[PDB]
């Protein structure tokens, strides 16, 4: 059978945390938690997170001004982040799941966590990690990923 949704949830924690670290470095305050990963960065899921941050670099830089402006208006903090994350992610996936949208969610998690840290003065990366993992679990994305062979599929389209 396919890998479990539970395995994908574990994998997602590693892909996200690796993605956040490597995305921050190529955009070069870093939240110090970002240097703590679930597993070594050379693990398979560590490598996937790194590659996804690389692949997205140019696209992300093109939307930076827009996104910064939008987050300045929303003012995410620890007190509203779950509501804002939930509403935004649900709208992202309303029409269906695809890889680009799944990777975009990692980028949203990055931006949300960095904003709450830089502007809201609160380290929130572990919490955003859980939001991302749990959203994928509960919205069929972990299962969709598992049925395509896991996160490695994103690099092999």
């Amino acid at each position: 059978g396919s890998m479990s949704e539970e395995q994908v949830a574990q994998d997602t924690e590693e892909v996200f945390r690796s993605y956040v670290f490597y995305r921050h470095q190529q955009e070069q305050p870093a939240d110090p938690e970002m240097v703590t990963l679930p597993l070594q960065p050379s693990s398979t899921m560590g490598q996937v997170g790194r590659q996804l941050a690389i692949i997205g670099d140019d696209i992300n830089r093109r939307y930076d001004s827009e996104f910064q402006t939008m987050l300045q208006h929303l003012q995410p903090t620890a007190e509203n982040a779950y509501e804002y994350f939930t509403k935004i992610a649900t709208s992202l996936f309303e029409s269906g799941i695809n890889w680009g949208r799944v990777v975009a969610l990692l980028g949203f998690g990055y931006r949300l966590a960095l904003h709450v840290y830089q502007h809201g003065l609160t380290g929130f990366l572990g919490q955003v990690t859980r939001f991302v993992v749990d959203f994928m679990l509960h919205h069929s994305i972990a299962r969709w990923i598992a049925q395509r062979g896991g996160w490695v599929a994103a690099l092999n389209l």
């Binding site: 692949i55 939307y63 935004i88 709208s91 389209l157």
Partner: peptide, 23 residues
């Protein structure tokens, strides 16, 4: 309200572009 849906629209646009880059 209004800003949340605009972030979602921006992420959908990013998603489309990432789909193209991954393929």
């Amino acid at each position: 309200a209004p800003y949340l849906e605009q972030v979602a629209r921006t992420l959908r646009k990013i998603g489309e572009e990432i789909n193209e880059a991954l393929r």
